[PDB]
Design an enzyme around this catalytic site. Structure first.
Site, short mmCIF file in Angstrom:
data_model
loop_
_atom_site.label_atom_id
_atom_site.label_comp_id
_atom_site.label_asym_id
_atom_site.label_seq_id
_atom_site.Cartn_x
_atom_site.Cartn_y
_atom_site.Cartn_z
CG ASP A 48 -1.94 -0.97 1.39
OD1 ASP A 48 -3.07 -0.79 0.68
OD2 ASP A 48 -1.70 -1.97 2.03
CG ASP A 96 -7.56 -2.56 8.32
OD1 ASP A 96 -8.41 -1.49 7.73
OD2 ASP A 96 -7.35 -3.34 7.53
CD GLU A 181 -12.15 -4.90 -0.98
OE1 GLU A 181 -13.11 -4.42 -0.14
OE2 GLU A 181 -11.92 -6.06 -1.08
CG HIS A 295 -19.01 -14.88 0.82
ND1 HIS A 295 -19.68 -15.41 1.92
CD2 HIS A 295 -17.85 -14.24 1.19
CE1 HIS A 295 -18.68 -15.04 2.91
NE2 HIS A 295 -17.60 -14.28 2.46
CB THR A 337 -11.45 -10.83 -2.48
OG1 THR A 337 -10.64 -11.58 -1.44
CG2 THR A 337 -12.83 -10.75 -2.18
CD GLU A 375 -6.72 -9.05 -2.73
OE1 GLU A 375 -6.88 -8.71 -1.77
OE2 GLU A 375 -5.66 -8.19 -3.56
CG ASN A 376 -5.41 -15.17 0.94
OD1 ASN A 376 -4.74 -14.68 0.04
ND2 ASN A 376 -5.54 -14.90 1.97
CB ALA A 377 -11.55 -12.93 1.67
CG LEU A 378 -11.34 -14.07 5.97
CD1 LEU A 378 -12.58 -15.01 6.78
CD2 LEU A 378 -11.23 -12.82 6.77
NE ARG A 415 -2.08 -7.78 5.64
CZ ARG A 415 -2.43 -7.11 4.60
NH1 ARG A 415 -1.51 -6.47 3.78
NH2 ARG A 415 -3.57 -6.88 4.26
O1 LIG Z 1 -3.04 -4.31 1.96
C1 LIG Z 1 -3.94 -4.38 0.92
C2 LIG Z 1 -5.22 -4.23 1.63
O2 LIG Z 1 -5.67 -5.04 2.76
C3 LIG Z 1 -6.57 -4.98 3.78
O3 LIG Z 1 -8.02 -5.25 2.72
C4 LIG Z 1 -8.21 -6.21 2.08
C5 LIG Z 1 -9.18 -7.29 3.07
O4 LIG Z 1 -8.36 -7.56 4.25
C6 LIG Z 1 -9.48 -8.59 2.34
O5 LIG Z 1 -10.51 -9.11 2.98
C7 LIG Z 1 -10.09 -8.21 1.06
O6 LIG Z 1 -11.30 -7.67 1.06
O7 LIG Z 1 -9.18 -7.46 0.13
C8 LIG Z 1 -9.07 -6.24 0.39
C9 LIG Z 1 -8.13 -5.43 -0.11
O8 LIG Z 1 -6.88 -6.20 -0.46
C10 LIG Z 1 -6.79 -3.69 4.32
O9 LIG Z 1 -7.97 -3.48 5.00
C11 LIG Z 1 -6.48 -2.59 3.13
O10 LIG Z 1 -6.62 -1.31 3.78
C12 LIG Z 1 -5.65 -2.80 2.39
O11 LIG Z 1 -5.41 -1.71 1.40
O1 LIG Z 2 -15.27 -7.98 7.24
C1 LIG Z 2 -15.53 -8.42 5.99
C2 LIG Z 2 -15.33 -10.16 5.83
O2 LIG Z 2 -16.53 -10.54 6.45
C3 LIG Z 2 -16.48 -12.06 6.86
O3 LIG Z 2 -15.32 -12.38 7.56
C4 LIG Z 2 -15.50 -13.00 8.94
C5 LIG Z 2 -15.74 -14.48 8.96
O4 LIG Z 2 -16.83 -14.75 8.28
C6 LIG Z 2 -15.81 -14.92 10.56
O5 LIG Z 2 -15.73 -16.24 10.67
C7 LIG Z 2 -14.62 -14.20 11.34
O6 LIG Z 2 -14.83 -14.58 12.61
O7 LIG Z 2 -14.77 -12.72 11.18
C8 LIG Z 2 -14.63 -12.39 9.67
C9 LIG Z 2 -14.40 -10.79 10.05
O8 LIG Z 2 -15.77 -10.35 9.61
C10 LIG Z 2 -16.48 -12.81 5.46
O9 LIG Z 2 -16.50 -14.08 5.61
C11 LIG Z 2 -15.58 -12.07 4.69
O10 LIG Z 2 -15.65 -12.80 3.23
C12 LIG Z 2 -15.46 -10.63 4.49
O11 LIG Z 2 -14.47 -10.24 3.66
#
Ligand SMILES: OC[C@H]1O[C@H](O[C@H]2[C@H](O)[C@@H](O)[C@@H](O)O[C@@H]2CO)[C@H](O)[C@@H](O)[C@@H]1O
Ligand SMILES: OC[C@H]1O[C@H](O[C@H]2[C@H](O)[C@@H](O)[C@H](O)O[C@@H]2CO)[C@H](O)[C@@H](O)[C@@H]1O
EC number: 3.2.1.2
Length: 490
Positions: A48, A96, A181, A295, A337, A375-378, A415
């Site tokens: 970033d 964050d 995003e 989702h 994602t 990218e993976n979300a979590l 990450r």
């Molecule tokens: O460092 C990139 C980006 O990471 C975080 O946002 C992610 C988020 O955590 C994921 O779950 C998914 O939504 O993709 C996002 C964008 O990559 C930070 O919250 C964000 O500030 C940062 O730019």
């Molecule tokens: O905050 C956006 C994300 O929310 C969910 O992620 C949850 C997850 O489902 C839950 O098991 C965990 O305890 O907390 C996280 C954080 O909210 C969605 O599953 C994600 O796709 C979203 O990015």
């Protein structure tokens, strides 16, 4: 040759690698970590480039020194870089761990004019991003929000000219909203939102409200008001008048609002991308944006969460392909994602369809002939997560007779952390990289796997909103394999 099936893997650097005081804190520490990624075969890293850190002092008061030191190190470690023009705040979203606000001088203007921030029906202002409502309002010491973003990218281009010329920077991700995003901050944890709350519409700032009222009046319905029966952040769709069966979202009024609401995001992205194209014209880099993977409630007719976030996606209306078509004129990459999630991993009451959502979005992109990355979300360290990512990377498997008919342009892993480097976790990650690379060794020259990057060309002519919206026509997704042919194992 197998190399044609090679999908590059990138790793996100820690948040705050350069602190809020604009200081590259631990070079030595990052270096050892980077060297390990290098040895693991990772193609590059993502970082970033925070607006709140660089243009902190005041308008056009940029300090790129700390970031030059970081880029220099990345280059010394033999890695390429995906740079995000991060015009958002770090702190209020999942994961964050550091607080990086947008420039203090912008926040100061917000003190006297609270409407520069996204606002919900209750009137709470979210300060993590500037509402699309002020994109073209010259209220920031003479500049509009878009000119600020534009000036920022040009300064980046000029001050990082040597790194751009040396081929260090490969992709320029342009943040278009919360978390970078292209979306509305409909699910703010900072305001008490909790998965799987439907979220709330964020169109109540005076600029967006005025625009809406003018719009409905031109449509012959001056009496129409913004949604007042959509509920609250943590409600379920059936408990609201807007999203329940035969609810408001299906009325002429509702369809007009939803169209208006989502169109604002398309134009927002289109206008800023125009500026990014001008700023980096001629540079050997590709432009990219991030689309959020919402989702939850994807499996019910109302798609409540997607709608509040600004993705007007229903079972009979594709709300993502028009975004893909918009990106085509800019020759940009659509980064999605949730590449790691499986439906079975989601609580049943959330009506989640991450797998089907991914299939829809990726298919829409390939359909529009644009490049798709993700990218993976979590954070995930298990083989099942990696195997799902690999599946989505090459939906129909590898081709031994040449390139795959379908393949993602690249995947960025979230990450870099000590957890990832743990002996056992890192060992699995190394296998993940190998399989993404189709069992081939790290390949330094992108040209070998048809990823040569040519000078950025000017954007194609503007595509009218009516043509973009033609992409809302539902299409059947491309066939997906039930599991990847390049598994990591377990
Ligand atoms: O460092 C990139 C980006 O990471 C975080 O946002 C992610 C988020 O955590 C994921 O779950 C998914 O939504 O993709 C996002 C964008 O990559 C930070 O919250 C964000 O500030 C940062 O730019
Ligand atoms: O905050 C956006 C994300 O929310 C969910 O992620 C949850 C997850 O489902 C839950 O098991 C965990 O305890 O907390 C996280 C954080 O909210 C969605 O599953 C994600 O796709 C979203 O990015």
């Amino acid at each position: 040759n197998m190399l044609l099936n090679y999908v590059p893997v990138y790793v996100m650097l820690p948040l705050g690698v350069v602190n809020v005081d604009n200081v590259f804190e631990d070079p030595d520490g990052l270096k050892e970590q980077l060297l390990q990624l290098r040895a693991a075969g990772v193609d590059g890293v993502m970082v970033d480039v925070w607006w709140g850190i660089i243009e902190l002092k005041g308008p056009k008061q940029y300090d790129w020194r700390a970031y030059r030191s970081l880029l220099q190190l990345v280059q010394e470690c033999g890695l390429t870089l995906q740079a995000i023009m991060s015009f958002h705040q770090c702190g209020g979203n999942v994961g964050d761990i550091v607080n990086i606000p947008i420039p203090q001088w912008v926040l100061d203007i917000g003190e006297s004019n609270h409407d520069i921030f996204y606002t919900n029906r209750s009137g709470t202002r979210n300060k993590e991003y500037l509402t699309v409502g002020v994109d073209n309002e010259p209220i920031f010491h003479g500049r509009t929000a878009i000119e600020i973003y534009s000036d920022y990218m040009k300064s980046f281009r000029e001050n990082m000219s040597d790194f751009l010329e040396s081929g260090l920077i490969i992709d320029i991700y342009v943040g278009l909203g919360p978390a970078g995003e292209l979306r509305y901050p409909s699910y703010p944890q900072s305001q008490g939102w909790e998965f799987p709350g439907i979220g709330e519409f964020q169109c109540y700032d005076k600029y967006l409200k005025a625009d809406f009222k003018a719009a409905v009046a031109r449509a012959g319905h001056p009496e129409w008001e913004l949604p007042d029966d959509a509920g609250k952040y943590n409600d379920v769709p059936e408990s609201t008048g807007f999203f329940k069966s035969n609810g408001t979202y299906v009325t002429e009024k509702g369809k007009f609002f939803l169209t208006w609401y989502s169109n604002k995001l398309l134009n927002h992205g289109d206008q800023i991308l125009d500026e990014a194209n001008k700023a980096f014209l001629g540079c050997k880099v590709k432009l990219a944006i991030k689309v959020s993977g919402i989702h939850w409630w994807y499996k019910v007719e109302n798609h409540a969460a997607e709608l509040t976030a600004g993705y007007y996606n229903l079972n009979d209306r594709d709300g993502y392909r028009p975004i893909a078509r918009m990106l085509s004129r800019h020759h940009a990459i659509l980064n999605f994602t949730c590449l790691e999630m499986r439906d079975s991993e989601q609580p049943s009451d959330a009506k989640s369809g991450p797998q089907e959502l991914v299939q829809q979005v990726l298919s829409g992109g390939w359909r529009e002939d644009i490049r798709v990355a993700g990218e993976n979300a979590l954070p995930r360290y298990d083989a099942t997560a990696y195997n799902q990512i690999i599946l989505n990377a090459r939906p129909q498997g590898v081709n031994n007779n040449g390139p795959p008919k379908l393949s993602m342009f690249g995947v960025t892993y979230l990450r870099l952390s000590d957890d990832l480097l743990q002996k056992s976790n890192f060992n699995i990650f190394k296998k993940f990289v190998l399989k993404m690379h189709a069992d081939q060794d790290y390949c330094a020259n992108p040209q070998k796997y048809n990823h040569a990057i040519t000078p950025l060309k000017p954007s194609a002519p503007k595509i009218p909103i009516e043509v973009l919206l033609e992409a809302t026509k539902p299409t059947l997704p491309f066939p997906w394999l039930p599991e990847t042919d390049m598994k990591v194992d377990g």
